[PDB]
Enzyme design. Structure first.
Site, PDB file in Angstrom:
ATOM      1  N   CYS A 167      39.931  65.140   0.125  1.00  0.00           N
ATOM      2  CA  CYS A 167      40.728  63.921  -0.036  1.00  0.00           C
ATOM      3  C   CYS A 167      40.680  62.715   0.927  1.00  0.00           C
ATOM      4  O   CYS A 167      40.576  61.454   0.620  1.00  0.00           O
ATOM      5  CB  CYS A 167      42.261  64.047   0.010  1.00  0.00           C
ATOM      6  SG  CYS A 167      43.073  64.867   1.265  1.00  0.00           S
ATOM      7  N   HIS A 188      48.054  64.424   2.334  1.00  0.00           N
ATOM      8  CA  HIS A 188      47.094  63.945   1.475  1.00  0.00           C
ATOM      9  C   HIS A 188      46.963  62.303   1.695  1.00  0.00           C
ATOM     10  O   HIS A 188      47.846  61.582   1.884  1.00  0.00           O
ATOM     11  CB  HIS A 188      47.978  64.268   0.073  1.00  0.00           C
ATOM     12  CG  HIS A 188      47.011  63.964  -1.209  1.00  0.00           C
ATOM     13  ND1 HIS A 188      45.904  64.064  -1.125  1.00  0.00           N
ATOM     14  CD2 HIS A 188      46.963  63.254  -2.041  1.00  0.00           C
ATOM     15  CE1 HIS A 188      45.339  63.931  -2.066  1.00  0.00           C
ATOM     16  NE2 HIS A 188      46.174  63.144  -3.071  1.00  0.00           N
ATOM     17  N   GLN A 245      42.077  59.299  -6.190  1.00  0.00           N
ATOM     18  CA  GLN A 245      42.227  60.511  -5.192  1.00  0.00           C
ATOM     19  C   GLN A 245      41.248  61.617  -5.435  1.00  0.00           C
ATOM     20  O   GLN A 245      40.900  61.578  -6.668  1.00  0.00           O
ATOM     21  CB  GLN A 245      43.668  60.962  -5.274  1.00  0.00           C
ATOM     22  CG  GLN A 245      43.970  61.545  -6.666  1.00  0.00           C
ATOM     23  CD  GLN A 245      45.250  62.322  -6.708  1.00  0.00           C
ATOM     24  OE1 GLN A 245      45.778  62.626  -5.506  1.00  0.00           O
ATOM     25  NE2 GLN A 245      45.616  62.679  -7.837  1.00  0.00           N
TER      26      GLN A 245
END
Length: 246
Positions: free
Chosen positions: A79, A134, A150
């Site tokens: 990510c 994240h 993402q």
């Protein structure tokens, strides 16, 4: 103008498609952030790999000592790697932008910040959500609409999802600036479990399936940080076009 959404969709689509090509992939997911993305040279990058492999005494030993992965293999970016690089691709023109070095806001609400952004410019926001563990991007085309970009190798509260798939399934699926404010607020961490789940699947899971999210894996004392950056839509297209054209 009105054609923005359609062109944006098309740009992302061709960009993603290109990512099955060796050079497109090498250039797109390299981790050197202090140089211009479009300045990346696939051959140069591949020589570095060959040199690294030579250092470890050949490819078979390199794999054996690094986890078994093939350094020449196409990449499925974690990510951080996908957020940083797509941020660069969107914002850069002729001056390198390093998303790891830029300044992040950390004591303002998404609502706060956005309500201060020139509605006649496009912005993209790189989010470092330490609660989720994240990083992802919020795209804010000129006008209000927000979109998510993402990738995720999984392991946290959210399921693994390839950037190509997120993009193909939900690339142009707009999300609530209000739900974004709630997510990206100091008090999210202290919200009722079912609400946390609600926002997560909503904003970040391809099927919006709450049963695919597991909030136990949230780090409730994690920090929230984000940084917005204006961009020129045509320049982003140009950049995307270069990469896809490799």
């Amino acid at each position: 103008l009105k054609h923005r959404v359609t062109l944006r969709k098309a740009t992302l689509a061709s960009l993603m498609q290109s990512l099955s090509g060796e050079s497109s992939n090498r250039v797109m997911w390299n981790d050197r952030y202090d140089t211009l993305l479009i300045a990346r040279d696939p051959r140069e990058i591949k020589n570095a790999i060959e040199k690294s492999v030579t250092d470890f005494g050949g490819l078979e030993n390199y794999k054996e000592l690094t986890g078994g992965a093939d350094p020449f293999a196409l990449m499925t970016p974690v990510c951080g790697l996908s957020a940083n690089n797509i941020f660069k691709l969107m914002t850069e023109k002729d001056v390198p932008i390093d998303p790891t070095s830029i300044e992040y806001l950390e004591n303002t609400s998404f609502a706060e910040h956005v309500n201060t952004l020139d509605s006649h410019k496009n912005y993209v926001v790189i989010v470092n959500d330490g609660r989720l563990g994240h990083k992802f991007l919020i795209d804010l085309p000129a006008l209000r609409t927000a979109y998510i970009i993402q990738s995720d190798l999984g392991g946290g509260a959210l399921p693994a999802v390839r950037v190509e798939d997120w993009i193909s399934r939900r690339g142009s699926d707009p999300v609530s600036l209000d739900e974004l404010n709630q997510l990206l607020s100091k008090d999210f961490s202290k919200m009722p479990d079912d609400v946390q789940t609600r926002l997560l699947a909503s904003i970040l899971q391809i099927d919006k399936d709450p049963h695919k999210v597991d909030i136990k894996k949230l780090h409730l004392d994690g920090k929230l940080r984000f940084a917005s950056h204006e961009y020129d839509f045509r320049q982003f297209q140009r950049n995307a076009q270069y990469v896809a054209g490799l």
